[PDB]
């Protein structure tokens, strides 16, 4: 196969090869130096004069006299099959579990394709996360993208790890046959430290969560382009298991801030003039091409569900990273520093949280039929309980009536009991049972978002 030796220029991550009209734009290439060491790159531009290759690793060692480029493949593709479960790969999807390299039933363009809008399907079934604040209030529904908004310091890894261990499909609540219903987790970690990798592995093994997962682990010290590829690898394997194998897949992407931080970098190093608050102008589109690879489709039993996870730079929900993710994804879960001191975990406060696809995933045949209303009440009664806290806050305590005293103690214990569950795996029923014993603190006529009868069932 051809070697291209006409290298005219190397600077930063770029190398230029003359007489390479036969390299396709976007082609993955191999690059060998005098020492014999081999290195990846990608054709990012091509003309009659030369091709610009963007090198994957450092550029140290390359020269213009003993360096040759060659085609590895015209489009970045991925060796994929359904035997990737229990496995554990890296950025580029080569094995890291000390197990054997695997045999693929197809090689897929890791860039994927947009789903045809007309071929989609309103997401309808719920996914039990085991966290009450998620499950009852902000339900993750199959086909959704619902990210966790966290903070440097805050324990997203733990939540990530937890939903990964706990999550499950509830066929017995939908009558559904369990056969066309295998449930898998595609974990994609971007720019993690060895300390956190150690953790996620430990966590996936500890209770065998590993056997039904495919890990795409990427470290902080890896060549940055591997970070850009990780979410693509993951979603490739996920679209595959989902839309050809009827898997319900849950994709967790931590940490998107590291992703976006890598996206720009690959642009500070490709010349590009930065957009708002200094990330790439097309960051909205790029993220779109990631998050949008989720959903459910007519004529298919399977699904792809995303939980991206992102530490906001200074708890600034208006930062490009969370702001853009916000315009693309379907709500979010937010990690309150406020709940972190009071010793609460998982620090998820329901009022800034929202799951926009929820109302179509709960209810008769999907969960329990009080669900929707109970969730709204639970909201209502916390919003109503929080706004009293503000009324009797900084200046003088005890400026309160009888009733509003009782919407008050419904906020204290809604934290201690509902929000603060530690590492309990709570089924939707147990979540609705606690919800109901939290509600019944209020008198009957105050549960206004609930049909009169439901009350009498679960209230007494």
């Amino acid at each position: 196969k051809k070697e291209y030796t006409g290298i005219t220029y190397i600077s930063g991550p770029l190398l230029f090869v003359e007489n390479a009209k036969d390299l396709a734009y976007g082609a993955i290439v191999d690059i060998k130096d005098g020492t014999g060491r081999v290195r990846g790159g990608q054709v990012i531009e091509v003309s009659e004069e030369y091709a610009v290759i963007q090198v994957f690793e450092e550029t140290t060692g390359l020269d213009l006299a003993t360096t040759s480029v060659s085609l590895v493949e015209d489009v970045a593709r991925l060796g994929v099959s359904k035997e990737m479960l229990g496995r554990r790969f890296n950025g580029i999807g080569k094995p890291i579990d000390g197990l054997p390299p695997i045999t693929p039933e197809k090689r897929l363009p890791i860039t994927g394709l947009p789903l045809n809008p007309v071929a989609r399907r309103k997401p309808e079934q719920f996914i039990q996360t085991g966290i009450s604040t998620i499950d009852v209030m902000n339900t993750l529904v199959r086909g959704q993208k619902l990210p966790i908004f966290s903070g440097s310091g805050l324990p997203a890894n733990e939540i990530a790890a937890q939903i990964a261990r706990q999550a499950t499909v509830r066929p017995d609540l939908s009558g559904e046959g369990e056969k066309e219903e295998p449930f898998a987790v595609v974990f994609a970690a971007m720019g993690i430290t060895q300390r956190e990798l150690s953790y996620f592995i430990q966590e996936f093994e500890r209770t065998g969560a590993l056997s039904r997962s495919v890990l795409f682990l990427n470290k902080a010290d890896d060549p940055t382009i591997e970070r850009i590829l990780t979410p693509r690898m993951a979603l490739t394997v996920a679209e595959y298991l989902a839309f050809e194998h009827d898997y319900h897949v849950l994709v967790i992407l931590t940490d998107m801030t590291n992703y976006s931080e890598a996206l720009r970098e690959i642009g500070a190093a490709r010349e590009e003039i930065p957009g708002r608050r200094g990330y790439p102008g097309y960051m909205y589109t790029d993220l779109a091409t990631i998050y949008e690879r989720a959903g459910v489709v007519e004529g298919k039993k399977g699904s792809v569900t995303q939980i991206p996870i992102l530490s906001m730079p200074d708890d600034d929900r208006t930062h490009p990273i969370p702001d853009l993710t916000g315009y693309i994804t379907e709500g979010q879960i937010q990690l309150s520093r406020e709940l972190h001191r009071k010793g609460i975990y998982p620090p998820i406060d329901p009022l800034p949280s929202l799951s926009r696809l929820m109302n179509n995933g709960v209810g008769k045949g999907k969960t329990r039929e009080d669900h929707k209303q109970v969730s709204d009440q639970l909201y209502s009664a916390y919003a109503n309980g929080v706004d009293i806290r503000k009324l009797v806050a900084i200046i003088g305590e005890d400026a309160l009536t009888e009733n509003d005293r009782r919407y008050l103690q419904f906020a204290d214990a809604f934290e201690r009991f509902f929000i603060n569950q530690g590492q309990q795996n709570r089924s939707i029923e147990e979540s609705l049972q606690i919800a109901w014993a939290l509600l019944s603190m209020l008198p009957q006529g105050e549960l206004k978002r609930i049909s009169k009868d439901h009350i009498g069932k679960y209230y007494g």
Partner: protein, 578 residues
């Protein structure tokens, strides 16, 4: 048609050489796959082509060929009940041809070439034809689709196809010129389709919903924004106008949407009912639909393709309702292109064409006498959609610097269960002044005053819950407990419109006049009652509050008698309270 090759490829940008005599903005076909693109630059013997789709895999040296024409839309029978992407490709046919995912370089046709249409000719040989005139007719669902002479074309008719069943490809009419006219013509989307004459906002756009009809109304062909924030019922309110508006056709362009937001439209719409016919509303709607990850260029054409399509249906002499949602997302798309065209970012994260263009689009709205002589309109209802909840968006400014009304939705009102969740203090109408003649003429000599009296009680209700807010309701003079309690009555019995209700789902100006007049009648009989030593609480016990209450639920036909009797009952029930 010019025949060059690829000299360079860098992302979606391609340089073709040897394309001699290629022209600015002509559509190109790029690479062996024939990917569609636009010439954005001519430099010597090269043309910079902006490729609408992913170029990855193309090699220097492949063919590049000019289509010789700028971006255009196909205007003919075949669009209604259709679902196109932002550059007029039928997504249904694509699915069928390629499956669940969208494959690049797929070549389908806006208008089905196989389907047979029932031509009824309306011109004979020797007839003179000018652009815009009706050649003949073809049924499309309920509508009598008119076959139009392209604007720009004219001459004498030589031959005509006899009534029969033809496809859109067939020369139904042929001129002495030799010019063949078909059931469709193409037309460039960035160029306003011509009209004979652009008309004044002296007519109502009848939406069906009282608060916008009575309070913040739009003229026929006017424009209007809505801020569709979550929590408020954007869909529902939007869907209702499509169902109940004095519009013959509804074009809904929406692109740059969340896949499931958008999908919520291709699944919901096919289930709405046309109140005029009893069958689907889809049969008189074109939807252009587009998503986050579908190509930049389509997300930006979207509202233009949609406005041209809208203009075409205008041109046949119908009222056309176009709602684009989301308009901020469109703007996002215009930002990306600007950046891709490597343009230096302007102040406040948008290119400085943003307004201009929001206007090259928005100003194509208008009610007109068409080239065919008929009258028609395009009334636009854009949505401004920033989850940031920031009216500061240069997008919202420019829009609002331009539309003739704003219908401010509010998730706050929704939470209270007030529907449709539009805010009377935030919203407004610019058309109001010049619709009063029509009003006095078509509703009642004393329309404006009555609606003025209502918005007047509203302000006052609004500025009383404010001095109840800081001094308690005890400090309220008698006339206050009343003002608040009718402000109440108007909220619950006049601003609230049940959208899923078989009657209240719609209300016309006449019924809206009645429900108004009753409130103010009741009001001024209470006004003279408290002044006379009658208990406001006894006033508030009167069983004719319920004749008011349950009025919006009464058949439109049964209302005139309901009004006449209830108006008579306000007298007797108040005269009884000596």
């Amino acid at each position: 048609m010019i025949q060059g090759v690829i000299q360079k490829i860098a992302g979606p940008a391609v340089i073709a050489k040897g394309m001699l005599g290629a022209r600015m903005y002509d559509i190109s076909k790029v690479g062996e796959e024939g990917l569609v693109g636009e010439i954005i630059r001519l430099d010597g013997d090269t043309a910079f082509v902006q490729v609408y789709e992913d170029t990855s895999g193309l090699k220097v040296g492949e063919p590049v060929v000019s289509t010789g024409l700028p971006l255009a839309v196909e205007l003919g029978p075949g669009m209604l009940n259709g679902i196109y992407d932002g550059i007029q490709r039928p997504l249904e046919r694509i699915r069928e041809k390629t499956g669940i995912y969208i494959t690049r370089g797929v070549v389908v046709h806006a208008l089905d070439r196989e389907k047979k249409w029932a031509w009824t000719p309306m011109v004979k040989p020797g007839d003179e034809v000018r652009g815009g005139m009706v050649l003949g007719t073809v049924p499309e669902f309920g509508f009598t689709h008119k076959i139009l002479v392209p604007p720009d074309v004219r001459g004498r008719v030589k031959e005509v196809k006899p009534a029969g069943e033809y496809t859109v490809e067939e020369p139904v009419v042929v001129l002495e010129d030799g010019t063949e006219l078909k059931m469709y013509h193409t037309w460039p989307v960035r160029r306003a389709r011509p009209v004979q004459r652009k008309l004044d906002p002296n007519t109502p756009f009848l939406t069906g919903m009282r608060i916008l009809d009575v309070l913040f109304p739009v003229a026929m062909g006017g424009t209007a924004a809505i801020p569709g924030p979550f929590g408020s019922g954007k869909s529902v309110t939007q869907q209702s106008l499509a169902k109940w508006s004095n519009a013959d056709v509804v074009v809904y362009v929406g692109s740059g949407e969340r896949g499931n937001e958008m999908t919520d439209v291709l699944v919901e719409f096919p289930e709405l009912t046309d109140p005029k016919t009893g069958g689907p509303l889809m049969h008189r709607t074109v939807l252009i639909a587009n998503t986050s990850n579908m190509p930049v260029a389509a997300r930006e054409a979207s509202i233009y393709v949609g406005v041209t399509i809208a203009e075409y249906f205008r041109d046949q002499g119908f009222s056309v309702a176009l709602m684009a949602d989301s308009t901020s997302r469109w703007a996002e798309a215009l930002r990306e292109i600007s950046s891709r065209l490597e343009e230096m970012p302007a102040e406040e994260g948008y290119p400085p064409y943003l307004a201009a263009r929001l206007a090259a689009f928005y100003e194509r709205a208008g009610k007109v006498i068409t080239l065919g002589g008929e009258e028609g309109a395009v009334t636009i209802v854009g949505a401004v959609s920033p989850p940031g909840g920031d009216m500061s968006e240069p997008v919202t400014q420019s829009t609002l610097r331009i539309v003739g009304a704003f219908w401010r939705l509010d998730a706050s009102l929704a939470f209270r269960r007030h529907f449709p969740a539009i805010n009377w203090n935030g919203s407004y109408s610019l058309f109001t002044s010049a619709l009063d003649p029509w009003y006095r003429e078509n509703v009642a000599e004393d329309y404006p005053e009555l609606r003025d009296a209502i918005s007047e009680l509203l302000q006052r209700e609004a500025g009383l819950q404010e001095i109840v807010q800081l001094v308690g309701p005890d400090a309220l003079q008698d006339a206050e407990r009343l003002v608040i309690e009718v402000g109440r009555i108007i909220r619950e019995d006049f601003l609230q419109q049940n959208a899923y209700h078989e009657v209240d789902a719609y209300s016309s100006m006449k019924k809206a006049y009645g429900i108004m007049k009753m409130i103010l009648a009741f009001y001024k009989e209470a006004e003279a009652a408290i002044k006379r030593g009658v208990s406001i609480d006894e006033i508030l016990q009167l069983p004719v509050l319920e004749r008011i209450g349950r009025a919006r639920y009464v058949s439109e036909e049964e209302f005139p008698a309901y009004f006449e009797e209830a108006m008579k009952e306000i007298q007797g029930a108040f005269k009884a309270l000596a």
